[PDB]
Ligand binder design. Sequence first.
Ligand code: CLR
Ligand code: CLR
Ligand code: CLR
Ligand code: CLR
Ligand code: NAG
Ligand code: NAG
Ligand code: NAG
Ligand code: NAG
Lengths: 344, 344, 344, 344
Amino acid sequence: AIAQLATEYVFSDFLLKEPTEPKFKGLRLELAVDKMVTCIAVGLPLLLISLAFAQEISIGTQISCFSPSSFSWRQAAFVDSYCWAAVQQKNSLQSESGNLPLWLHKFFPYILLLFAILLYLPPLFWRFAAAPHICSDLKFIMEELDKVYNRAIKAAKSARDFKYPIVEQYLKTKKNSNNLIIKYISCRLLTLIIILLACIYLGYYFSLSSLSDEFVCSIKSGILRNDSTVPDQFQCKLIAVGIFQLLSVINLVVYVLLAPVVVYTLFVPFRQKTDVLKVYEILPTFDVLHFKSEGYNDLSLYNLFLEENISEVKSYKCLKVLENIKSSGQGIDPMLLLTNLGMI
Amino acid sequence: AIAQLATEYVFSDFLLKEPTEPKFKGLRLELAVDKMVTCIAVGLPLLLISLAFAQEISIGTQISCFSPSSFSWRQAAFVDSYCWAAVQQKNSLQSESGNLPLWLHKFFPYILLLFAILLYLPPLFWRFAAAPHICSDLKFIMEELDKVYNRAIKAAKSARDFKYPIVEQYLKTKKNSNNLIIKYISCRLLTLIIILLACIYLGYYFSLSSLSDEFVCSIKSGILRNDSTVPDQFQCKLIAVGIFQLLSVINLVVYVLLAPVVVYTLFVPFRQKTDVLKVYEILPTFDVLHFKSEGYNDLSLYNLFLEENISEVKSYKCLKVLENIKSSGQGIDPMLLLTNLGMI
Amino acid sequence: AIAQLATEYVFSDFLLKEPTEPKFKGLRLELAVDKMVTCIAVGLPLLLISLAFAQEISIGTQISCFSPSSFSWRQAAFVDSYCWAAVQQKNSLQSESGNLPLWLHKFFPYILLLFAILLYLPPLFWRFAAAPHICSDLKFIMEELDKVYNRAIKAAKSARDFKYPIVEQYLKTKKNSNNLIIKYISCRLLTLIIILLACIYLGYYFSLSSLSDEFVCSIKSGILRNDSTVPDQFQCKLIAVGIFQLLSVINLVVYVLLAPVVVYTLFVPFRQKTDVLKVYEILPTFDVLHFKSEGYNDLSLYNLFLEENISEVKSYKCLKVLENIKSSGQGIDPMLLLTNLGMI
Amino acid sequence: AIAQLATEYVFSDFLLKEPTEPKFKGLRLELAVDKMVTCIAVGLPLLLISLAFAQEISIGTQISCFSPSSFSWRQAAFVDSYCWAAVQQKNSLQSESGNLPLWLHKFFPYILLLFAILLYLPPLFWRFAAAPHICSDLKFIMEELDKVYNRAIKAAKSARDFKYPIVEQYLKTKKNSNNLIIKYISCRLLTLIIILLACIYLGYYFSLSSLSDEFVCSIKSGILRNDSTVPDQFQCKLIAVGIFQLLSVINLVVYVLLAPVVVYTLFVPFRQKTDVLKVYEILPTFDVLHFKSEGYNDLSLYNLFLEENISEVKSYKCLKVLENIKSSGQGIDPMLLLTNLGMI
Ligand SMILES: CC(C)CCC[C@@H](C)[C@H]1CC[C@H]2[C@@H]3CC=C4C[C@@H](O)CC[C@]4(C)[C@H]3CC[C@]12C
Ligand SMILES: CC(C)CCC[C@@H](C)[C@H]1CC[C@H]2[C@@H]3CC=C4C[C@@H](O)CC[C@]4(C)[C@H]3CC[C@]12C
Ligand SMILES: CC(C)CCC[C@@H](C)[C@H]1CC[C@H]2[C@@H]3CC=C4C[C@@H](O)CC[C@]4(C)[C@H]3CC[C@]12C
Ligand SMILES: CC(C)CCC[C@@H](C)[C@H]1CC[C@H]2[C@@H]3CC=C4C[C@@H](O)CC[C@]4(C)[C@H]3CC[C@]12C
Ligand SMILES: *[C@@H]1O[C@H](CO)[C@@H](O)[C@H](O)[C@H]1NC(C)=O
Ligand SMILES: *[C@@H]1O[C@H](CO)[C@@H](O)[C@H](O)[C@H]1NC(C)=O
Ligand SMILES: *[C@@H]1O[C@H](CO)[C@@H](O)[C@H](O)[C@H]1NC(C)=O
Ligand SMILES: *[C@@H]1O[C@H](CO)[C@@H](O)[C@H](O)[C@H]1NC(C)=O
């Protein structure tokens, strides 16, 4: 049913499942824009495949050949199945557009599934090769931030009654290596390349004459060659090709809307904005240094992932509360922090 | 079965699922009127699609063409499938109303699913882009309110035997920025625009002549062109078009009933009523200031979400009990609060 | 449906299920490259089998024989089923390519399933015969590393206020025996051999004339032998053979892309890189000795499995944080370790 | 679908389910070679049955009879069903090979299921009659070994700062009785006998003429006896008999590969190797005596089950670590044990 496919592929959490494992607990490991680009680019061809053969849009078989009236039921079934299998054998069928449109019309679901798989591959490579590396580091950074917050408020609490910037040094180190960022821009670049190839294929397929689904087929190989009761050629038509073209144009539109999103995603430093650690600079136990910007290096990627997963950090939440209050400038940062009383 | 679709789409918790995650625990993050508008505007086209092809309302195929009596079974099947695929090819079919009604009749389920998806998109954008931002802030506000209540009753209990309005300052800050409110009114405005476009389309479709489902179809392209045994044209009829129109008028009625609800939702300040924090003004540890009204700013949105999710706050419940008792004015607020004894 | 098979075999965690048992908790026991090689080499033939008979690619029966027009419906059904069963009996059918292509065309799904099973067998033998042996040892090594880290920081903490390298001696012992490594390279070698045999078979099958699916069949054994109403021979065609060849070439391409991966996997010492225990050499309670390289011995296999599962080790994570910071060389290892304060 | 059966019967944990009960927690109670022999010998006939009627290998009905052209559709259906039911009634059908091949061709799935059930019976008898007896004893032995290890390290720890070999005496007692071992070799012997009978049957069935699936059938009992419009005899063919023979040869090959495995399993003392308790002899609280070898007695069976389930024993793991280190002979057993510090 149409509504079942709708639920399964947009309303269900299709490709939105969090990693079912206690190693990454609440950690996203895939940027929201990347998760939605993957969800679209993968589920849309699948949803379109499932629609192209919805039981109410499909009239029946995928091909019909119009055997003569003298032909029995089973002879007509043979003609249909023969021509269906004969869209490959170029000698049997004669089509005005060519044999390539026939191949594309028969194997359109396979090609869409191929595009879905190829578009799922880069997110899978990211989830397996580079997601744990960033997950461990991000979990460690969040733990260290919570610890420095607790120590700062404990020092402030003792005042109301070591000191090494380890996380800052770790991020300074991340500023050097660029392995994770080249992995990220490589998976994004393969996603963009596959999306553009899919756009090219879908634009070509939609550009077909729309009469290329009608091909002349001749069951005259083998012992049927010199047979006389069988006519020389049959007029076959590939049903559901109009549906294929109408769905291919939808896929092409969505994909050419998605390609600018991927291209923008490709520029990872430009997206690093609203410096997340700047809110921590108001802590005594934390050095006054953001030092996170301007590079095609893993530091910018970590900045993005921190900007995403930082809302889970309670210390960040309270510090941002104080920072927003500081916009008015009524009281003072350490006083409001001591008032806070939120170690964990 | 009809009853299965009924269960799935009204009696089941379709699109009423709470976010399956411990980040938002009992927090709604979608106003009840917005949740019901989404549920209706999305499930109604899906429920209608599923009804339009219920096994007891569908007689069989979606098209029937009445081949001549001389035609065999398979030749008639070819005529049916050809004309089904030929509602697209404008050269083959001749219809009094035009080819556009034929397109709309064949692809009515697809268009309804498209409307369902487009109507689901703004709630999805709200759930992903702006729901966590409001969720963290609302959870922090509820925690701070419980804390101030506990501190107030502890001070009162010590009397029977810091002091910074942090949440008030946070809300004062929210009064300034308007990012969340423009996100909210933007998703609501896109919902209204898509609902109005759906109303326009459904009113047009229902306005079709009701004989536009009968079209004359000619299987005479290719080698069949100069064939003589095949008649010049066939009288095809698109079954289940009357069902499509009867369901389109239902969808249009429900949508023109839903559009005023969305328009009213669009006026977020007007809906901010029954000042929820006013009940907290009777606490000594809480400054005597509501300061939440009159603006197209995120403060009004936070007021709505607080009015919704505030029933989960135990301190709010007890304070509202005292406030309602105060209507009689028998005793006194601090005495009844000390009697209360409900820290958590 | 195509999309259902897509989900089940690429988007679902097919053959990615962690061992459902508390004996191995978070331990991989299968290298990521080996897990992906198994997933591909097993799920691809299964996914291809499921595609070759997707309800929208299949026109109907797998064989059609074109009985004469005088034949009744049931007589034509008999001819179809007889020839289907007669691709085996070499006396009945006469084919230009031979009877072997006919056998291969009828039993192509069985042969692909056979290849899937044979390719699943070596990973199963590894999971049952050699996975627990390495699992117990790896869990013990991780526990001992956490213990030595805790003891080192406790000694450092006492300074701020036994001693036997047991794990080093255990690994030195592993350096001697080679049972696990010969088991590993044997399962990998059988995987490579079966992949190469599958490549050979698929390249042969795809090389078939593409007209070998058309065979002449004669229902003239038994009492039908001297019967006259039945014609001498029927022109049968095996539908879905073009689909079989198009899928066999896909399987062959993926398999010849997979074979270099298996060959590279076969060289286990070469893959032992980024010495994982080198990060532990900065501990006083740990002897300054890596001693893990250069051999076709179980030590290299344990090095690979440690490199994989070591991210679960918290002590390793903190030590790698200190080691990366040491790249700048600002402070000192023991001071930063004492600052660390992460016993568990 | 083929791939569904593949998953269910090889890739799923079919007949690999651990006993769903807290009485045996992590205890195997079935030797790995016995578990795999059972899995193969049971799932292979089931997987073959499911394949023999895969929807893409089955052309349709299991029998086709070729009624005359004058026969109506329902008369031909009657002939087919009559001959299908008439492979039993020996008077009606005349076959060159005999009626026994016809019986075997009709009831091949039943015979394979019968073999699967009979091969599942001995493992079931072992799981119910003799598995709890060995489970309680093995759990007690593991608990006693952990206890003696704890007591030995506690005595060693007190030195760094009763005494009855109960488990040794228990095993000495097991050395006497042979009930469990005769139960084990009896279930293995019945498994071997049933496997050999299945090999004999499958080798016979595969040896059929391959034209025994074509039998002449005569619907001429009752009032049809002297009827004239019905022909004297019909040429029926049992479709899917070639598939049955091709699958029977596969089953026979796998079974004659499995029979040597069962025969080797039958020699339980020979398999008792790598004396597991020898690693415990380095404990002071444990007497220096293995005393486990050379007998057709329950002690050898317990040795096998201990060798299997001993990896769950933590004390055994640590002791084996020390024993492997002792190969180099650098330090000393009690010193390294005291260093160990792994009571539980
Ligand atoms: C990502 C964006 C740019 C994609 C836009 C669609 C493009 C790729 C499509 C739309 C129209 C298409 C063209 C339409 C017709 C023809 C003529 C044919 O003989 C060769 C292919 C060719 C030349 C097509 C190539 C692909 C094409 C240019
Ligand atoms: C939200 C509310 C206002 C929706 C009410 C339904 C509206 C949009 C419907 C109801 C009747 C419809 C009209 C009925 C008939 C025609 C004539 C046709 O040649 C062009 C479209 C046109 C002019 C329709 C346009 C859409 C229409 C005005
Ligand atoms: C792993 C790589 C090398 C596999 C490449 C595919 C190989 C195995 C394929 C591709 C073309 C195939 C050949 C194509 C045609 C023939 C002629 C035939 O009468 C015998 C088999 C033979 C000779 C095939 C043998 C297998 C073959 C060589
Ligand atoms: C476990 C191993 C030894 C099994 C090997 C298969 C054996 C049991 C098979 C293979 C060939 C078979 C023989 C083939 C043909 C005949 C002739 C027939 O008139 C009586 C049965 C008899 C004599 C079969 C008996 C069983 C048989 C010997
Ligand atoms: C069919 O008859 C024609 C007559 O020209 C002949 O050329 C051809 O070889 C024949 N084919 C068969 C299958 O007999
Ligand atoms: C069909 O016959 C007509 C006769 O006028 C001719 O014009 C047309 O080209 C023919 N078409 C085919 C397919 O032969
Ligand atoms: C069929 O008739 C032919 C005539 O030559 C004869 O040789 C053969 O034995 C007959 N077969 C049967 C089944 O009667
Ligand atoms: C059928 O007719 C024959 C003629 O010989 C006779 O012997 C037989 O008894 C009849 N059977 C029935 C059912 O009338």
